Design a protein around this ligand. Structure first.
Ligand SMILES: *[C@@H]1O[C@H](CO)[C@@H](O[C@@H]2O[C@H](CO)[C@@H](O[C@@H]3O[C@H](CO)[C@@H](O)[C@H](O[C@H]4O[C@H](CO)[C@@H](O)[C@H](O)[C@@H]4O)[C@@H]3O)[C@H](O)[C@H]2NC(C)=O)[C@H](O)[C@H]1NC(C)=O
Ligand SMILES: *[C@@H]1O[C@H](CO)[C@@H](O[C@@H]2O[C@H](CO)[C@@H](O[C@@H]3O[C@H](CO)[C@@H](O)[C@H](O[C@H]4O[C@H](CO)[C@@H](O)[C@H](O)[C@@H]4O)[C@@H]3O)[C@H](O)[C@H]2NC(C)=O)[C@H](O)[C@H]1NC(C)=O
Ligand SMILES: *[C@@H]1O[C@H](CO)[C@@H](O[C@@H]2O[C@H](CO)[C@@H](O)[C@H](O)[C@H]2NC(C)=O)[C@H](O)[C@H]1NC(C)=O
Ligand SMILES: *[C@@H]1O[C@H](CO)[C@@H](O[C@@H]2O[C@H](CO)[C@@H](O)[C@H](O)[C@H]2NC(C)=O)[C@H](O)[C@H]1NC(C)=O
Ligand SMILES: *[C@@H]1O[C@H](CO)[C@@H](O)[C@H](O)[C@H]1NC(C)=O
Ligand SMILES: *[C@@H]1O[C@H](CO)[C@@H](O)[C@H](O)[C@H]1NC(C)=O
Ligand SMILES: [Ca+2]
Ligand SMILES: [Ca+2]
Lengths: 51, 103, 71, 103, 71
């Protein structure tokens, strides 16, 4: 399962009135293990916000 | 008319546990994205962030293919949860109490 | 000094920058330590870093002293 | 008597995944309306409106047709959720935690 | 000036009122940007409007300079 991270969407964002959205960038990362050379991927989205 | 025939043909031997690749050694590419709609809650007592989001998965299935010219008008089909393969993408850092918050 | 690293997939033999002449590797069990085994992090650091209670480190000072266990 | 026969005939080859049109190229018309019963809550903390409403969908199914004269007394039939086709009409801007609040 | 618009279905070639001699189009990805593609909004405006971070605009000043991409 070769995960591929495409970018996040904010066209539908609805501000709530207690937090301001700085951004939501993403990062594809990979983790290796003792059993074999094959890597295990993941996609992390980091919601950043200021009060 | 053509829909019935197509739906019959597509599920003739389909298995929803089988990753849909022609060559089992090659990988299946899955494009994963996201769509945030609002921030719902930012608790500091339980250290939990509550969001509203729509996931977006896109992949390719080798066994669900057909010729448009032989099925005029049938350009798409729709399958429920347990009738075809979906990837097991889910939130590692979930605190939901059902662990899969998705519909 | 040439140190193996995991930030590059496939596992690379990147050549370390100056100031960092210790190839290191760090290994611990995650949830999937029954089938997949322990995790592996390889790199080159100034001096080999702190070992948490659940982490193991095997620190070298030679070229390619920190390969994946298969190798 | 006639009910048994009718229900048997109607589901002989019916597929609930198939949009019920004679010509697959032509569209299916769906009349969608609404019936509000009361306002239940207007939160400003979570920005959520809680209402009570009954949806109203009306469409036409080509495969569920019969002659009244051949089935005297049977003027209507009723089918549960997963036995016939229903349209996938649902609220885009839902904040329910099950995303389909309908019964 | 004649500007394509989307407020009329099927896509029309409405003839714009005075004071607005710029046909414009605005395109962005919604959720369904994998299968359906980006959204399309066509019209005629006084001066072509602001481009949000996620929106793209291609502004013209000629007749039928803003058609649907198929065309
Ligand atoms: C199906 O899966 C099972 C389990 O995932 C697998 O059996 C397991 O394989 C692993 C890896 O071969 C075994 O772990 C080994 O155990 C022996 C004895 O305890 C250790 O000596 C081995 O040492 C290695 O790992 C060390 C970690 O520090 C290294 O330092 C050392 O150099 C070695 O590389 C290794 O840990 C495990 O015991 C079995 N069984 C179980 C129950 O886990 C099985 O092989 C898989 N089947 C197939 C066909 O793949
Ligand atoms: C089944 O669905 C899939 C996916 O929906 C579809 O394959 C996709 O088709 C689209 C549209 O043809 C492809 O998008 C194109 O990608 C190429 C290469 O990246 C671009 O050069 C194309 O550019 C167009 O769009 C631009 C947007 O700004 C325009 O400026 C430009 O002028 C072009 O019009 C276009 O973006 C897409 O790459 C594929 N594949 C995937 C994975 O999305 C497939 O065709 C469908 N099958 C059938 C039978 O319909
Ligand atoms: C399925 O994939 C395997 C892995 O790539 C194919 O076997 C490889 O074929 C390439 C040629 O393209 C060789 O260079 C590799 O040495 C082969 N590796 C192995 C392990 O066999 C296999 O041919 C593919 N099957 C089909 C039907 O195409
Ligand atoms: C199903 O619908 C298609 C689309 O309308 C029909 O084919 C069209 O028929 C009309 C005649 O009414 C022609 O003017 C169009 O040029 C045809 N278009 C195409 C793409 O064929 C088709 O005949 C209908 N099928 C049946 C059985 O009535
Ligand atoms: C099926 O597709 C092929 C092209 O891949 C085409 O030549 C053929 O005509 C199509 N089927 C029919 C019935 O035409
Ligand atoms: C079925 O309907 C037709 C009219 O569409 C009618 O002529 C016929 O009599 C009906 N069936 C029977 C058994 O009468
Ligand atoms: Ca709080
Ligand atoms: Ca209130």
């Amino acid at each position: 399962l070769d995960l591929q991270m495409q970018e996040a969407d904010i066209s539908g964002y609805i501000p709530n009135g207690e937090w301001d959205l700085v951004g939501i960038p993403g990062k594809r990362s990979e983790r290796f293990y003792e059993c074999c050379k094959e890597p295990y991927p993941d996609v992390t989205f980091t919601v950043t916000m200021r009060r | 008319e053509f829909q019935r025939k197509l739906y019959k043909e597509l599920v003739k031997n389909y298995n929803p546990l089988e990753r849909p690749v022609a060559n089992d050694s090659q990988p299946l590419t899955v494009y994963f994205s996201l769509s945030l709609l609002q921030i719902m809650d930012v608790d500091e007592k339980n250290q939990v962030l509550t969001t509203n989001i729509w996931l977006q998965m896109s992949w390719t299935d080798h066994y669900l293919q057909w010729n448009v010219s032989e099925y005029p008008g049938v350009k798409t089909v729709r399958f429920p949860d347990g009738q075809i393969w979906k990837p097991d993408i889910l939130l590692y850092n979930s605190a939901d109490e059902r662990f899969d918050a998705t519909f | 000094i040439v140190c193996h690293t995991t930030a590059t997939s496939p596992i690379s033999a990147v050549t370390c920058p100056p100031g960092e002449n210790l190839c290191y590797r760090k290994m611990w069990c995650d949830v999937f330590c029954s089938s997949r085994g322990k995790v592996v992090e390889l790199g080159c650091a100034a001096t080999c870093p702190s070992k948490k209670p659940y982490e193991e480190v095997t620190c070298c000072s030679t070229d390619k002293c920190n390969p994946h266990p298969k190798q």
